[PDB]
Write a protein that holds these residues in place. Structure first.
Motif, PDB file in Angstrom:
ATOM      1  N   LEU A   1       0.995  -1.322  -0.134  1.00 38.95           N
ATOM      2  CA  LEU A   1       0.157   0.030   0.102  1.00 38.95           C
ATOM      3  C   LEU A   1       0.896   1.002   0.002  1.00 38.95           C
ATOM      4  CD1 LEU A   1      -2.490  -1.532   0.017  1.00 38.95           C
ATOM      5  CD2 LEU A   1      -3.023  -1.044   2.231  1.00 38.95           C
ATOM      6  N   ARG A   2       1.962   0.971   0.749  1.00 41.44           N
ATOM      7  CA  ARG A   2       2.901   2.328   0.734  1.00 41.44           C
ATOM      8  C   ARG A   2       3.440   2.456  -0.824  1.00 41.44           C
ATOM      9  NH1 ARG A   2       7.176   1.938   5.800  1.00 41.44           N
ATOM     10  NH2 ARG A   2       5.543   2.286   7.513  1.00 41.44           N
TER      11      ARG A   2
ATOM     12  N   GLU B   1       2.055   1.762  -3.618  1.00 37.50           N
ATOM     13  CA  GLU B   1       0.766   2.062  -4.424  1.00 37.50           C
ATOM     14  C   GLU B   1       0.657   3.618  -4.284  1.00 37.50           C
ATOM     15  OE1 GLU B   1      -2.648  -0.159  -3.574  1.00 37.50           O
ATOM     16  OE2 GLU B   1      -1.731  -2.057  -4.313  1.00 37.50           O
ATOM     17  N   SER B   2       0.595   4.102  -2.991  1.00 38.81           N
ATOM     18  CA  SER B   2       0.380   5.485  -2.761  1.00 38.81           C
ATOM     19  C   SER B   2       1.610   6.211  -3.156  1.00 38.81           C
ATOM     20  CB  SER B   2       0.430   5.588  -0.920  1.00 38.81           C
ATOM     21  OG  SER B   2       0.301   7.008  -0.786  1.00 38.81           O
TER      22      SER B   2
ATOM     23  N   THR C   1       1.550   6.593  -7.200  1.00 39.80           N
ATOM     24  CA  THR C   1       0.560   7.466  -7.575  1.00 39.80           C
ATOM     25  C   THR C   1       1.026   9.042  -7.830  1.00 39.80           C
ATOM     26  OG1 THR C   1      -1.149   6.020  -6.711  1.00 39.80           O
ATOM     27  CG2 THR C   1      -1.817   8.252  -7.031  1.00 39.80           C
TER      28      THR C   1
ATOM     29  N   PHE D   1      -0.293  13.803  -3.518  1.00 36.79           N
ATOM     30  CA  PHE D   1       0.512  13.166  -2.403  1.00 36.79           C
ATOM     31  C   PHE D   1       0.006  13.957  -1.243  1.00 36.79           C
ATOM     32  CE2 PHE D   1       3.959  13.257   0.645  1.00 36.79           C
ATOM     33  CZ  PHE D   1       4.089  11.933   0.866  1.00 36.79           C
TER      34      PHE D   1
ATOM     35  N   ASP E   1      -3.059  14.353  -0.591  1.00 38.25           N
ATOM     36  CA  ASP E   1      -3.968  15.329  -1.113  1.00 38.25           C
ATOM     37  C   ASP E   1      -3.628  16.610  -1.604  1.00 38.25           C
ATOM     38  OD1 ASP E   1      -6.106  13.286  -0.999  1.00 38.25           O
ATOM     39  OD2 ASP E   1      -6.550  14.203   0.970  1.00 38.25           O
TER      40      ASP E   1
END
Lengths: 130, 133
Positions: free
Chosen positions: B52-53, B55-56, B59, B92, B94
């Motif tokens: 998940l890290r 993926e974030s 992005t 990143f 938001d």
């Protein structure tokens, strides 16, 4: 000398820091060291100011060596750094609470002395506690 | 293992960085154990949380590249210092993308068994990137 000898020197200096033995803390540093942080050379005068500000805020800092690796003329260490926030840091009054941060250090040796040093420091766990 | 295993592990680490930069994901993943243990900030990070890290991060920074500044190998371990560079192209935290280039710095350690990474530790300084958002 050998990588194992350099590794011993690095561990000795950390142990001397924690045990308060100044002779051992500085024993294996060259007078002419070049420091690097964030892919820039940090002038020695700027390094001193960094250490001064940090020691004012965190005078009881201790160094917990989590791993050490040595090859040829280099030694790398991973250190868990802990302290109490006892003096002002960035003009924030001391909380008297324990803080932590994490470092990776690399040292290059010539003739048993550190002549070049690199760090990667994650201060975020401490900054969250300010 | 044998006395030249450390040299082989070093070669594998450099091959994985080169594979990353050329976009060949399988040249990275081939040498990781599915049961690798990751450590960061003195805790074990579950593999699902590490994904998940990533993926974030991708992005926000989809073109990230890895510049090896040093690699050392001894016995079953390898340590690398890496300059990480990317363009801020996606959100990143938001914050809308700036489309500017950013840099952060990592120190990585890998422990190998039979040519596979079975344990991994990082120390990451994100501050040079955070200061540019």
């Amino acid at each position: 000398l050998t990588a194992a000898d350099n590794k011993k020197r690095c561990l000795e200096m950390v142990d001397a820091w924690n045990r308060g033995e100044l002779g051992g803390v500085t024993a294996h540093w060259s007078p002419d060291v070049v420091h690097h942080s964030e892919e820039r050379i940090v002038p020695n005068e700027e390094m001193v100011l960094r250490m001064e500000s940090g020691l004012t805020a965190f005078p009881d800092v201790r160094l917990d060596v989590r791993s050490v690796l040595a090859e040829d003329d280099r030694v790398s260490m991973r250190i868990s750094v802990t302290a109490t926030h006892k003096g002002p840091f960035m003009d924030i009054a001391p909380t008297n609470r324990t803080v932590t941060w994490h470092t990776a250090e690399e040292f290059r040796f010539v003739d048993g002395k550190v002549v070049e040093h690199w760090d990667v420091i994650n201060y975020m766990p401490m900054l969250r506690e300010l």
